[PDB]
Amino acid sequence: SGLVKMSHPSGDVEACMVQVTCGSMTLNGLWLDNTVWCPRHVMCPADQLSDPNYDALLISMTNHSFSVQKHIGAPANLRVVGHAMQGTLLKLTVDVANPSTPAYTFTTVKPGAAFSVLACYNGRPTGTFTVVMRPNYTIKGSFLCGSAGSVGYTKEGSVINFCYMHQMELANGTHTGSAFDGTMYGAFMDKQVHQVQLTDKYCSVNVVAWLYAAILNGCAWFVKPNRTSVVSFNEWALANQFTEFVGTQSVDMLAVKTGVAIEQLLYAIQQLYTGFQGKQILGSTMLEDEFTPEDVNMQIM
Amino acid sequence: SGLVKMSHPSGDVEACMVQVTCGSMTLNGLWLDNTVWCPRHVMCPADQLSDPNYDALLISMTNHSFSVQKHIGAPANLRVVGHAMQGTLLKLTVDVANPSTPAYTFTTVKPGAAFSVLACYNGRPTGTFTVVMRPNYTIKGSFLCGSAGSVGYTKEGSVINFCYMHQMELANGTHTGSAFDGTMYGAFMDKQVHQVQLTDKYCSVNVVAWLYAAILNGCAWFVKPNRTSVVSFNEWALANQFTEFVGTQSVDMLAVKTGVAIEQLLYAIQQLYTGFQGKQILGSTMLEDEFTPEDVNMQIMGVV
């Protein structure tokens, strides 16, 4: 009954991690059914990562180019019987179906949404943590060299939604990766040139959730009777580095649980961005946008 | 690079979780070999929790009083064939041995040490997070009603150190539990009465680690030539709600890597205690003390 960074139990997804090796290069892959997903830059030699030619590289491969070992749990015999390139991912086909494939889906996450990351090295889970997809389509993770192919996901019921496969580091503590459709979040290129990122923003709905959590724990000094409408807050947001606020039923439950209307918190957010004055809020003298409405509902029940 | 709140993968420990039911009370238990560990207040009924007689509650039990079900993973029912009390924990014996018992130890952690927690409800793992054993022998986590028996651990190679089993809430967001020798952390009582908690302190050595992580991630604005000695800082600490700084080799690797001495960050902590004056350090506006030197070394350099 505090507000902490919380991840899904990782057991489910650990049972799907494998190591993919191609020549002298190695990284992680995700083994679902008869498929192993991994980043395509496993085909690329270190010196050529500046300007790879993936179309060339793909051609020069046979199935015997790809080596897949399973280290965690039950071992280890995966023969690659096919290989395809899908955007910034490779799609390897293997002769054995993962007996431990969860019920799963492949939905792309949106800015502000949270997901769990299983950080792996050489096909071995080493740690798990949770992030939110930034409005500029980066995440703030904890990745060293060799973590490519680490998997990000969410869990509703026993259905895993795989939403992220790690690719690269754009700057200090700034990362991105692929959705399992093969597209890179934020359209960054999987080559090692410096690329510019768009400006970041506060996730408005996540700040509202956080303010609700502060109220639910007795910190409500910022609540006034004043209101800003959603439509009016969103005009303001455009020019002050906040995202468009979009209401959800998860926000609505917090409004009911506390007696404070969304529009009062939208007004407070406008004030708090001018300054906290004193003044702390679970505090912190700055806005928190890394907890979702769902986060706050499940941890402060 | 990047520094996040990082937990161990929980697959190992998930396979060990079970539900223990006794009368009307239900919570989580930990299943190792032929033993299921759970908090003993599962014997105490709804209202008697104000103050219970645990020696009495124990005698009024047989093995049939206890029901253990494994819900997640490899399904099972486990018959209880013995029962004992040890401190604040029951030690239940079951007929089937856990076929996925990890290599493990039972060690008690000291204040400032971090560990992973697997939060469970009704024998089902729902989330994992990392905590530090606070100087006042509480932990700050997310434990709702029904999470007693949730388990905390550190992992070293294949060996899991089990160091915590959740017991109770105290103040808001303030929790405590048992080591697996049965002793409650900070001598608290498993009882719905109120007990006095010592004041919290900042874990100075973790704050230093966090500041080194800042420097290593390109955030060094708080670094000045000025220095406070360890001895001097520790006198200051007593008066200002900080722990005694004790250096380790792990802190030293960070001093070597950044070129910034410990004594420079001791002086910076004294200046940052007052306040960050509108700036932030790794996205925070207050000192962070739940990143340990070992944790920072592992995330930033992959080292021990």
Side-chain angles (χ1 to χ4, degrees), chain B residues 143-209:
Chain B
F143 304 89
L144 300 191
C145 185
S147 67
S150 299
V151 146
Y153 49 91
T154 63
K155 222 177 285 187
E156 182 77 14
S158 71
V159 179
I160 299 178
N161 174 37
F162 290 109
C163 62
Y164 180 90
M165 175 167 272
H166 187 52
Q167 290 274 3
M168 58 188 303
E169 186 151 349
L170 297 167
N172 178 62
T174 304
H175 305 97
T176 194
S178 321
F180 275 86
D181 56 26
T183 64
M184 187 91 112
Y185 276 102
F188 292 94
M189 308 174 299
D190 43 341
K191 200 176 29 153
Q192 247 181 336
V193 83
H194 188 180
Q195 309 133 91
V196 277
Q197 358 168 2
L198 313 175
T199 187
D200 213 350
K201 299 186 149 97
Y202 290 94
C203 308
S204 310
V205 69
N206 297 346
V207 183
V208 168

Side-chain angles (χ1 to χ4, degrees), chain A residues 1-2 4-7 9-11 14 126-129 140-144 169 172-173 175 217 284-286 298-299, chain B residues 1-2 4-7 9-11 14 126-129 141-144 169 172-173 175 217 280 285-286 299-300 302:
Chain A
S1 179
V4 307
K5 249 72 195 293
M6 183 171 277
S7 304
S10 62
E14 294 171 47
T126 61
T128 194
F129 59 91
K140 324 284 283 154
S142 187
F143 300 102
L144 299 176
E169 180 157 313
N172 273 339
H175 311 98
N217 295 127
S284 213
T285 40
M286 288 200 95
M298 72 171 277
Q299 296 183 27
Chain B
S1 61
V4 301
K5 266 166 68 190
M6 174 98 60
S7 305
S10 57
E14 288 172 49
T126 59
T128 190
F129 49 93
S142 189
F143 304 89
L144 300 191
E169 186 151 349
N172 178 62
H175 305 97
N217 282 280
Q280 59 198 336
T285 63
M286 80 233 79
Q299 296 189 41
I300 305 307

Side-chain angles (χ1 to χ4, degrees), chain A residues 277-280 283-285, chain B residues 202 207 210-211 221-222 224 228 233 236 239-242 265-279 281 284-288:
Chain A
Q277 318 151 344
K279 249 314 200 197
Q280 295 175 19
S284 213
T285 40
Chain B
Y202 290 94
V207 183
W210 171 69
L211 291 176
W221 65 261
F222 50 86
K224 282 164 182 56
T228 302
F233 177 89
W236 180 86
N240 296 99
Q241 304 192 292
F242 273 78
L265 298 184
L266 297 183
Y267 169 93
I269 283 168
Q270 291 175 321
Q271 307 308 304
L272 290 165
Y273 184 52
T274 82
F276 291 23
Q277 289 199 111
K279 274 143 170 313
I281 301 172
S284 200
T285 63
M286 80 233 79
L287 303 166
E288 303 285 344

Side-chain angles (χ1 to χ4, degrees), chain A residues 269-289:
Chain A
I269 290 174
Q270 280 164 321
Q271 298 306 308
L272 289 167
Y273 174 78
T274 288
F276 273 49
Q277 318 151 344
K279 249 314 200 197
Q280 295 175 19
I281 300 198
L282 304 183
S284 213
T285 40
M286 288 200 95
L287 302 171
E288 250 302 332
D289 75 348

Side-chain angles (χ1 to χ4, degrees), chain A residues 40-41 43-45 48 52-61:
Chain A
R40 64 178 182 179
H41 72 246
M43 294 178 327
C44 187
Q48 309 177 16
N53 196 308
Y54 288 106
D55 292 322
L57 283 165
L58 177 60
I59 280 314
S60 65
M61 301 289 160

Side-chain angles (χ1 to χ4, degrees), chain A:
Chain A
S1 179
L3 210 46
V4 307
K5 249 72 195 293
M6 183 171 277
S7 304
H8 292 295
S10 62
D12 275 7
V13 183
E14 294 171 47
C16 300
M17 300 310 303
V18 294
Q19 178 172 32
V20 174
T21 326
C22 174
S24 45
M25 205 83 156
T26 208
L27 40 62
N28 302 281
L30 186 65
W31 182 30
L32 308 174
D33 297 311
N34 269 94
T35 305
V36 173
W37 306 86
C38 70
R40 64 178 182 179
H41 72 246
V42 76
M43 294 178 327
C44 187
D47 33 274
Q48 309 177 16
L49 278 165
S50 315
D51 184 27
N53 196 308
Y54 288 106
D55 292 322
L57 283 165
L58 177 60
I59 280 314
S60 65
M61 301 289 160
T62 105
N63 289 346
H64 214 239
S65 314
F66 300 109
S67 186
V68 185
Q69 311 76 244
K70 176 177 185 44
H71 304 310
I72 260 40
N77 237 326
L78 293 191
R79 185 202 180 211
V80 181
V81 306
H83 68 280
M85 185 169 57
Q86 179 164 341
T88 55
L89 302 185
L90 295 176
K91 192 180 184 183
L92 308 179
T93 305
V94 285
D95 65 317
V96 194
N98 184 342
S100 273
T101 297
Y104 73 95
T105 67
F106 276 148
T107 319
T108 301
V109 279
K110 329 205 186 65
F115 59 97
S116 295
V117 172
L118 186 61
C120 306
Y121 296 86
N122 310 297
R124 283 177 174 86
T126 61
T128 194
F129 59 91
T130 178
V131 301
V132 286
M133 175 63 64
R134 300 315 304 177
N136 67 359
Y137 297 92
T138 65
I139 58 170
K140 324 284 283 154
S142 187
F143 300 102
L144 299 176
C145 193
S147 63
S150 290
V151 146
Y153 60 94
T154 65
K155 227 140 153 168
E156 184 177 2
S158 52
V159 180
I160 318 293
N161 186 66
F162 293 102
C163 63
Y164 182 93
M165 171 158 284
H166 182 65
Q167 290 273 356
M168 58 195 308
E169 180 157 313
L170 303 178
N172 273 339
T174 307
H175 311 98
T176 179
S178 303
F180 283 82
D181 60 15
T183 58
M184 193 86 80
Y185 286 99
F188 293 94
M189 305 174 296
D190 49 344
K191 62 182 67 178
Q192 60 153 8
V193 53
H194 178 242
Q195 318 176 54
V196 80
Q197 312 118 55
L198 304 170
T199 194
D200 207 4
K201 291 170 191 165
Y202 295 103
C203 309
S204 302
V205 62
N206 288 359
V207 175
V208 168
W210 172 70
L211 289 183
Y212 272 128
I215 299 168
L216 287 170
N217 295 127
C219 176
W221 67 265
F222 49 87
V223 181
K224 279 140 72 179
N226 316 39
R227 299 162 58 100
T228 296
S229 59
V230 172
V231 13
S232 179
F233 179 87
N234 283 336
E235 289 174 30
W236 179 83
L238 280 184
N240 298 283
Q241 277 169 329
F242 284 73
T243 57
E244 162 176 0
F245 178 92
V246 167
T248 76
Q249 175 179 9
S250 200
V251 184
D252 290 332
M253 296 182 51
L254 303 166
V256 168
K257 209 191 282 203
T258 61
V260 186
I262 294 176
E263 291 83 6
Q264 292 171 268
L265 292 195
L266 290 184
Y267 177 83
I269 290 174
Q270 280 164 321
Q271 298 306 308
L272 289 167
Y273 174 78
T274 288
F276 273 49
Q277 318 151 344
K279 249 314 200 197
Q280 295 175 19
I281 300 198
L282 304 183
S284 213
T285 40
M286 288 200 95
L287 302 171
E288 250 302 332
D289 75 348
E290 313 189 329
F291 297 94
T292 68
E294 303 74 5
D295 270 323
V296 175
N297 272 284
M298 72 171 277
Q299 296 183 27
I300 314 194
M301 263 163 195

